[PDB]
């Protein structure tokens, strides 16, 4: 719906009050911009009821995400799930998001799909996730143009982390050496990922048998390309 | 008459249910705009694909109904079905001693 | 030669002058390094030198001078030969870039150079460039391996001037020949001559080569040596030669251990074939029955081959009259029964 | 098939058990589905959606090196080409690997070969050509029995690329002497000749009045049929191996033989690389709806790419180099050919 910044501002003014009681709001393809994201940032501070927020397929640029991150970084905020897709992000946005992830305590889900984060942004995010204070539950990466060095850093990050459960790396170009590193990280007892997004058949025989060897270890893990497998039913059921 | 509507019926079967509803609505608009030839709205609504093709041919005519369907196909951003329809129209629309002894013995 | 500064100065001036008319030049084991570098610099832009071969004990500064010589827009040396020169990967890299820049030479001879896989990949990347006209190329005792062979198959598919190619003393027997078949089955390959020698060719390679030959392929010549292909390999080769479609011109068989039971099929094939022009045999135990059957069939048949060579363990008067019968029955056949300038090497 | 440990069907295990009894001594593969209502893939949360999954569902043994392929979805058949003849397969039965063609069309002539093949879009004819052959032959597929209906003459010429435009009843072919001929299928008479470039043109693509050709000389040319003007050249740095055209939007896809893919616009001279590999690209094919394309190269890989920027959605490995690919008009089946076999994959999304 072509709501626009004006409509988002009117909703913002309505949600500013403490007596609103709605918990989940979604706005995709609503012609948002940086100013609308600023309105949402102003409305979000001081509100404790709303929990799930989504802004996908909107050209909310790096700066808008910076405003949102600055707003969310105080513990007072009670936002758990935020997912934004196709928002034209870059590396500096990723550094700010990494600071958010390391510091905050209430966020439990995040989604970055069809964004050109590249290797630098993912390196910053790996620094963010390395901290044992983080409590992020699931992370969505796809079509983010990853490569060998970033996957090495990511493998080390996963080796260091314990709280993360679900992940996604599809439509990404990985060289065999990087995948060897990734699988070595996967097999470690330290990391307990219950869901992984990868296509087994996309890789050579050595890699395929390596993934199968990782699988026979930790029989609970499931590797399935089509993400959203065994995910919470409510997330998609609510929408339709 | 039947030979031409057979191909049209088989072209429309490619359209999906949502595409079929869009086709019917666009046909409603086309009929409303034109004044030379008219179609009832409730009859367009109640008809399914087979009745739609036969009704289209009953009112417009063979070539005119084919051309209308092709134009509407192009309008919905379908280009492959347009070419298939043009070809199927090109095909469905009419232009406007010893041997004798041997064989007896074998017998 | 160990030279001195004054001699080298005068000599290089003489070489660089317009009164010089050298067409071939060879510098090997020149010392010290500065003198060799100065000599190679004298050739920069020469209007008459069309050959050049190089060799030395130390090479740390050979490559800068050679690459300057090649990068020159006026150098016209048509043939370049590097022998036993030691180098490193960066040296191969800048030499390959120079050969990318160069537009004159058509024959390159790299023998005994300690290439590894990486340098081979760089040279191949140079050869796939759409603007190189290297027609002949030798990689002998370069210590290659099958993966380079797959890259070379890609080169063969892509390249558009390379006709002669030599791969001797390279352990690329089975997988290498499989990949070369993958590259040569392509209906538009241009290669005309391939050389295999001490490459560990076996029956599988013979089968693949036969499958290549039965079709209308490009290569006119094929060389085999130190390849034990006795029974199955020769079965495949002879059933290949028998057909009317083969256009192979020359076939070399040396140290291949052809037994008499294979020689019967060999003789049948020779009687059947009509397009081969040259054949070579040597070190193969054909002595008692094989030679006699071969000579008898040669007298009986009238094949197109002109030259034929063999070695006989022990001959008699009957064998001499058999040779006379071969001569009289067909006058155009020349038979001998007695190595760098070898005919193929003369062509490459 | 080859990827799995062993491909089994649902009735095959019962047949095996009954055979054991008689002699006295996921997990199951699926078949390919045709009806759109059966397809039943959930909406992501006709169609321009980018595919997201693949599965091999048959292997076709040709018996000799496969040079070209073609797939039809209106009829279920598949066409395979080799140096000695063409073989027609059927996709209606259920079997892991088939050895019995629906038909076989051999060509007998001393020193005659086949290189190319091409299936008209309406699935009613099929073109064929090769070296040392008297003429380019077209087969009639709609008739009750296969037979050659027309012969398009070319004496002492070696064709290497074929293309056809049915709206204007034209057929094109490129010969090794750098000559392109245009035939009018009604009369089978040559119309116009394009010449002047010795290296030849390995690939030709026709849309509208523009013929796009590219060859090892590292140039891409755009001929116009309405006039005798010189072609417009776009110089590249490597040698082009294949071409394809976008049906909806103005964009020409091409492979560079150095593992690079580019897009080129007809209206203006804009370029931008859309993918890179370590191998030689031997064929690039566009999807009928134009939102993705398939690529096959020398390093044993089949890949699918996304039109907007060139991101590769996924790819599948293989044991031997692939040399040709084709995508069905249903946008659901893709066929590739390596070694002496041809494989069929189904697209789901």
Swiss-Prot record, chain B:
Family the UniProt entry places it in: Belongs to the NLRP family.
Cellular location(s): Cytoplasm; Cytoplasmic vesicle, Secretory vesicle, Cortical granule; Mitochondrion; Nucleus, Nucleolus
Name assigned to this protein: NACHT, LRR and PYD domains-containing protein 5
Result of changing residue 86 to P: In OZEMA19; uncertain significance
Post-translational modification, as annotated: Phosphorylated by PRKCE.
The protein's assembly and partners: Component of the subcortical maternal complex (SCMC), at least composed of NLRP5, KHDC3, OOEP, and TLE6 isoform 1. Within the complex, interacts with OOEP, KHDC3L and TLE6. The SCMC may facilitate translocation of its components between the nuclear and cytoplasmic compartments. As part of the SCMC interacts with the SCMC-associated protein ZBED3. As part of the SCMC interacts with the SCMC-associated protein CFL1/Cofilin-1. Interacts with PRKCE. Interacts with TUBB3 at cytoskeleton microtubules.
Impact after mutating residue 50 to A: Impaired formation of the subcortical maternal complex (SCMC)
UniProt function note: Component of the subcortical maternal complex (SCMC), a multiprotein complex that plays a key role in early embryonic development. The SCMC complex is a structural constituent of cytoplasmic lattices, which consist in fibrous structures found in the cytoplasm of oocytes and preimplantation embryos. They are required to store maternal proteins critical for embryonic development, such as proteins that control epigenetic reprogramming of the preimplantation embryo, and prevent their degradation or activation.
Pyrin domain location: 1-91
Disease: Oocyte/zygote/embryo maturation arrest 19: An autosomal recessive female infertility disorder characterized by reduced fertilization rate, oocyte maturation arrest at germinal vesicle stage, and early embryonic arrest.
Biological source species: Homo sapiens (Human)
Positions with biased composition (Basic and acidic residues): 85-95
Phylogenetic classification of the source organism: Eukaryota, Metazoa, Chordata, Craniata, Vertebrata
UniProtKB/Swiss-Prot annotation, chain C:
UniProt keyword annotation of Repeat present: yes
Induction (free text): By interferons and bacterial lipopolysaccharides (LPS).
Residues in LRR repeats: 104-124, 133-153, 161-181, 190-210, 218-238, 247-268, 275-295, 302-325
Tissues expressing the protein: Expressed at high levels in lung, placenta and thymus and at lower levels in ovary, intestine and brain. Highly abundant in oocytes and early embryos, however poorly expressed in somatic tissues such as brain, kidney, liver and spinal cord.
Main location: cytoplasm
UniProt-reported outcome of changing residue 140 to D: In OZEMA18; uncertain significance
GO molecular function: ATP binding; Pyrin domain binding
Similarity field: Belongs to the NLRP family.
Organism annotation: Homo sapiens
Subcellular location, record wording: Cytoplasm
Subunit structure comment from the entry: Interacts with CHUK. Interacts with IKBKB. Interacts with IKBKG. Interacts with MEFV. Interacts with PYCARD. Interacts (via pyrin domain) with PYDC2. Interacts with CARD8.
Keyword ATP-binding: yes
A GO cellular-component term linked to this record: cytosol
Coiled coil: none
Function: Suppresses TNF- and CD40-induced NFKB1 activity at the level of the IKK complex, by inhibiting NFKBIA degradation induced by TNF. When associated with PYCARD, activates CASP1, leading to the secretion of mature pro-inflammatory cytokine IL1B. May be a component of the inflammasome, a protein complex which also includes PYCARD, CARD8 and CASP1 and whose function would be the activation of pro-inflammatory caspases.
Full-protein residues shown: 709 to 1062 of 1062
Comment, domains: When isolated, the NACHT domain is involved in interaction with CARD8. This interaction is not detected for the full-length protein, maybe due to autoinhibition, this inhibition might by relieved by an inducible change in protein folding. The pyrin domain is necessary and sufficient for suppression of NFKB1 activation induced by TNF and for inducing IL1B secretion in collaboration with caspase-1. It is involved in interaction with PYCARD.
UniProt protein name: NACHT, LRR and PYD domains-containing protein 2
Swiss-Prot record, chain D:
Compartment annotation: Cytoplasm; Nucleus
One GO cellular component, as annotated: subcortical maternal complex
Phenotype upon changing residue 280 to I: In OZEMA15; uncertain significance
Consequence the record notes for mutating residue 173 to T: In OZEMA15; impaired formation of the SCMC complex
Mutagenesis / variant outcome for changing residue 129 to R: In OZEMA15; uncertain significance
Protein's GO biological process: actin filament organization; embryonic process involved in female pregnancy; endoplasmic reticulum localization; epigenetic programming in the zygotic pronuclei; establishment of spindle localization; flagellated sperm motility; mitochondrion localization; negative regulation of canonical Wnt signaling pathway
Phenotypic consequence of residue 287 to Y: In OZEMA15; almost complete loss of phosphorylation and reduced interaction with KHDC3L and OOEP
Keywords, ordered alphabetically: Cytoplasm, Disease variant, Nucleus, Phosphoprotein, Repeat, Transcription, Transcription regulation, WD repeat
Residues with PTM Phosphoserine: 287
The organism's place on the tree of life at top rank: Eukaryota
One Gene Ontology MF term: structural constituent of cytoplasmic lattice
UniProt repeat feature WD, residue ranges: 61-99, 109-149, 154-193, 196-233, 235-274, 276-315, 317-348
Domain notes: Contrary to other WD repeat Groucho/TLE family members, does not contain any identifiable Q, GP, CcN or SP domains. Only the C-terminal WD-repeat domain is conserved.
Self-association and partners: Homodimers. Component of the subcortical maternal complex (SCMC), at least composed of NLRP5, KHDC3, OOEP, and TLE6. Within the complex, interacts with NLRP5, KHDC3 and OOEP. The SCMC may facilitate translocation of its components between the nuclear and cytoplasmic compartments. As part of the SCMC interacts with the SCMC-associated protein ZBED3. As part of the SCMC interacts with the SCMC-associated protein NLRP4F. As part of the SCMC interacts with the SCMC-associated protein CFL1/Cofilin-1. Interacts with FOXG1/BF-1; the interaction inhibits TLE1 interaction with FOXG1/BF-1.
Family (UniProt): Belongs to the WD repeat Groucho/TLE family.
The name this protein goes by in its record: Transducin-like enhancer protein 6
